[PDB]
Design a protein around this nucleic acid. Structure first.
Lengths: 109, 112, 139, 51
RNA sequence: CAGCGGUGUUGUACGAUAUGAGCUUUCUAUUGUAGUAGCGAGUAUUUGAGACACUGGUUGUUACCACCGUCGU
RNA sequence: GAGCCUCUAGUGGAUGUUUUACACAUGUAAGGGAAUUCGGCAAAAUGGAUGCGUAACUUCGGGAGAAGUAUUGGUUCAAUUG
RNA sequence: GUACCGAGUGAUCGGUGGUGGAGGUAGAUGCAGAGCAGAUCUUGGUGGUAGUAGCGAUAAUUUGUCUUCAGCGGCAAAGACU
RNA sequence: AUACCACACACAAGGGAUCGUUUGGCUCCUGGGACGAGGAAGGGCGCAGCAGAGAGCGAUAUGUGUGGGAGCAGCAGCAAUG
């Protein structure tokens, strides 16, 4: 995975990355742009991104015309099974009470 | 035996719509092997095919509003759209009155 | 009208049987070279030395509260000139001594400043310094 | 529809038995020169006029 | 991405607590005493609060040093 | 058995890109208010219920919802259809 | 039938080398359904325009997982609509 | 004109002209000129070991008698007891 097989835990500013996107389709295009954010943060454009169903379900919670302001996610990096020339990044939802104090952390296991 | 067909036959057996049938995920082989209504009856007995519950539609607000209107709330001049006669029919008021009065006179005469 | 209202309706006569270069057509607008003649220097100064007028006895730099919107704070020397100037913030410009002297009375008059505005350019700016904001609010 | 006369039904029964390709063994016979049965029809492309 | 400073926009968060035009008289222990309440729009305090953005200021953490082609010496 | 919202039962694909100008369906506008145009064409304004108050003319039936004006939410009470 | 080369003012005629696989002329006369660039000619076959114009009125779609072997196909979980 | 457009030649595509062939047509001549209540002409439906169309035949849907005589076109079976 990452250095010392750690997972990286980060927060995604969904409010900012979607500023220009139309109200009618906000949640549909937000998914395309969450994946793009990840690939630039780890400098790996050609890689795959995989979204766990719990994270999908959190994002769609107020229907198509909305998206949450911030979301906290744990990321793992693995070789892509269907073509191991690529990597795949796997995203898991982390439930938080408040965002105050949460930076970017790397955690063992 | 394609899985869409399993749902149709199950819907027939459990007397509900296809939108309420749940197929269990961990033994698709066991489902796909089914050939007949008697196979499906066994799968239903074993709990691999399940009828889901209905979606909720509560009467909380309807009851609350009804009690308030019984106390005489709402029902002011800015809440009514029909004519006085549509809301409280005039022929019905007459018919209620005159039957009471006639009944009163009948009893008084008959009792002397 | 059908087929659109935001156009020139007639783009020529039958003869000559070509479109003339004098008729208006759609195309590029903006991003052209332009020279503005005879602009006057009101003030010259430095971004980190405070200054005062004979009348405004506050001492402050040229920088407004929170800086200029996509630039921040001036640090080096600066010039101040009358009116507006070509291009957005951050573009390079060339300055030249005037080609010929002006006879107009509006150009050749003296300038005496009494106040310079230093309030915020984001939103309605209602204070001239952080001291005033700290005094208006509590503590 | 579901209601039919006897005369209409026999027309449908006959029109249904005739609608078949050349059987695969005939193609091997020395003297036989047909490629495809030109009398085959589709319900999407023609009417029987049974009415 | 977060602190901590700075500059704005909106208008005073959730939850508690107190009051409120009026309407009402319930319970426990036990013979007679003591205990002893409900229902209610709104308003005030905590609270220029809470939310949201930008920072060419400053601290922490995390990521990034490749590769392929063309013309020349 | 209007429009708007839900229960039972049923439902959906020519891919990606924030995407100028000119369009086609729509919103909003300082001061002025038909100056526009063959022509107020298009749009705006009025709108339900309750009360007060209602002209010429008329075949005496009508005109007539004439016109013109006021009221309307939530809560807690009285009184019983006002 | 196809390339070359020669003869004739010309309509046309002759030879050589490949392809083809069973029929064909030179002279004199006889009989005609006897010579094409055109008729908005008749029938059949093919271009440029052009990888262009267009293919998207209506409720709306996302994620995982298996097949499919590469079907927004099927199944689970959400989001919508009549 | 490095790559576009045009023309010439060789090879590969695309189409079906030409030449060679014909169990068909047309014309003239000669014969014939034979249907039905004893159900005609014309229409429908059935019949094969594997059988759609067409040909042949009627629930006897390849039967009887006479004259002949070697195979039944594919696959499986039949045939001098035809």
């Amino acid at each position: 995975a990452f250095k010392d097989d750690k997972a990286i835990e980060l927060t995604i500013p969904m409010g900012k990355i979607t500023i220009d996107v139309s109200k009618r389709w906000k949640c549909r295009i937000g998914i395309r742009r969450l994946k793009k954010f990840i690939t630039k943060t780890f400098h790996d454009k050609e890689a795959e991104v995989q979204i766990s169903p719990d994270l999908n379900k959190f994002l769609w919670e107020r229907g198509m015309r909305n998206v949450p302001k911030r979301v906290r996610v744990r990321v793992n990096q693995e070789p892509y099974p269907k073509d191991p020339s690529k990597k795949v990044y796997k995203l898991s939802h982390v439930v938080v009470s408040t965002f105050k104090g949460l930076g970017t952390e790397a955690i063992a296991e | 035996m394609k899985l869409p067909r399993v749902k149709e036959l199950s819907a027939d057996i459990l007397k509900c719509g296809v939108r309420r049938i749940y197929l269990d995920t961990f033994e698709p082989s066991k489902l796909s092997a089914a050939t007949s209504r008697d196979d499906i009856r066994k799968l239903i007995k074993d709990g691999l095919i399940v009828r889901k519950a209905q979606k909720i539609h509560s009467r909380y607000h309807a009851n609350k509003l009804m009690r308030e209107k019984e106390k005489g709330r709402h029902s002011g001049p800015g809440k009514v759209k029909g004519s006085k006669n549509a809301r409280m029919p005039e022929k019905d008021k007459w018919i209620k009155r005159i039957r009471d009065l006639r009944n009163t006179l009948k009893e008084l005469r008959d009792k002397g | 009208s059908r087929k659109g209202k935001r156009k020139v309706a007639c783009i020529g006569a039958w003869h000559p049987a070509n479109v003339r270069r004098t008729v208006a057509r759609a195309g590029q607008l903006g991003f052209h070279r332009r020279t503005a003649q005879n602009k006057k220097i009101y003030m010259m100064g430095n971004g980190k030395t405070p200054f005062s007028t004979e009348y405004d006895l506050t001492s402050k730099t040229i920088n407004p509260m929170g800086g200029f919107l996509r630039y921040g704070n001036v640090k080096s020397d600066f010039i101040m000139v009358k009116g507006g100037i070509q291009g957005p913030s951050k573009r390079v410009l060339a300055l030249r001594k005037a080609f010929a002297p002006s006879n107009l009375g509006k150009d050749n008059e003296e300038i005496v400043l009494k106040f310079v505005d230093a309030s915020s350019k984001k939103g309605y700016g209602r204070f001239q310094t952080t001291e005033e904001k700290k005094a208006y609010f509590g503590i | 529809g579901s209601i039919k006369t006897r005369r209409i039904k026999v027309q449908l029964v006959s029109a249904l038995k005739k609608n078949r390709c050349i059987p695969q063994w005939k193609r091997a016979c020395p003297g036989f020169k047909q490629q495809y049965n030109f009398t085959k029809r589709s319900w999407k492309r023609k009417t029987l006029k049974a009415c």
